[PDB]
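anyone seen this seq b4? input:
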Amino acid sequence: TLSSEKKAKKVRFYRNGDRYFKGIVYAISPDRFRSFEALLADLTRTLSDNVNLPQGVRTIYTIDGLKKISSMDQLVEGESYVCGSIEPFKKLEYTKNVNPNWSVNV
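predicted toks r here
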């Protein structure tokens, strides 16, 4: 630590079309991910594999699939988002049975 996790914005990212992966928590702050393109690049590093988002993360959706994120301030503390690549948004119950404590005790 150089800064507290309690002061960082924690959000959870899922993979479009992937029902079984239950997401990854990212801490976003003035010292962490300072740019949108650094966030997308890291999401590719962590989430993109040979069968999941293989071309790379291109899009971040709200959990309903109805909005594509364009700025970091649209990411809301404790909310969940879905990373997409080439296939359109797939509506799954991504957050089902995922306990919210990842956003509380950090």
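Residues 1-106 form a domain with the Ubiquitin-like (UB roll) fold (CATH 3.10.20.230). The chain has one helix and four strands. kinda curious what u guys think
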